[PDB]
Design a protein around this ligand. Sequence first.
Ligand SMILES: CCNC(=O)c1cc2c(-c3cc(OCCN(CC)CC)c(Cl)cc3Cl)nc(N)nc2s1
Length: 261
Amino acid sequence: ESMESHQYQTEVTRLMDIIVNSLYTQKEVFLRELISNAADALEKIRFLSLSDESVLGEEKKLEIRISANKEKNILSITDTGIGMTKVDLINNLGTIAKSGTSNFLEAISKSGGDMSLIGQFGVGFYSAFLVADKVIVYTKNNDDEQYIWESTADAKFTIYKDPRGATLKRGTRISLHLKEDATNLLNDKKLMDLISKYSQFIQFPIYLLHENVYTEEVLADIAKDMVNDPNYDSVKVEETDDPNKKTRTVEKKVKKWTLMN
Ligand SMILES: CCNC(=O)c1cc2c(-c3cc(OCCN(CC)CC)c(Cl)cc3Cl)nc(N)nc2s1
């Protein structure tokens, strides 16, 4: 059941209308905003770890992880930053609702200005709706349990405890359920370009999960047993009609993490 106020639904509908009509040709900028949010959250927990190192108890990693799921049409930006308690999340939503950021952006757009301040105005998250019709946020902060915040393009949201528990240990995962028009964002070449572009001044490692293909010649009888290997996402054995051939070219596809900065 939706938990938005009419004020939240109005403010966010205005933000979305302005952001969309102002950035319809630069849809890709959502990634700059999400990476920016993630670095800010990582800086918060990094700063606290200087006085009390025990804050990193649940997860020593301090990084950003980008991964696409081509079958489910989902893009995820995950970080091991501070994360949010239910209190931090509802405060953040109340901040968005009470502020008149849409007044500032309406003014910027009417004046012929750009959306380069959406990040400084703390509304950069809503740029995700340029490419997605549904955004599912999973978050975990040391002081609370893991929560799920599920938002839609109609400015409606719902918050509930994660049935699977603290799968994140510490940090936040932004899962974008992409629109049919945003398929290009699941490709390794596009993501690599976008991440190299938007990582310029990010003091934390950014990792991309991309396809690695392994090719070798194998004896036909073993080529059939290669298919079963669970260490690979998929195994493609070459199809041959000639019973002459005693060997088969085998392509083993699997995704590994590469440091992008
Ligand atoms: C312990 C406190 N932790 C937090 O507050 C965290 C937030 C976030 C956000 C994040 C930040 C957002 O807005 C930034 C501006 N707000 C706060 C000034 C005012 C609305 C939004 Cl609209 C959405 C998300 Cl998901 N993103 C990420 N990856 N991590 C965190 S950890």
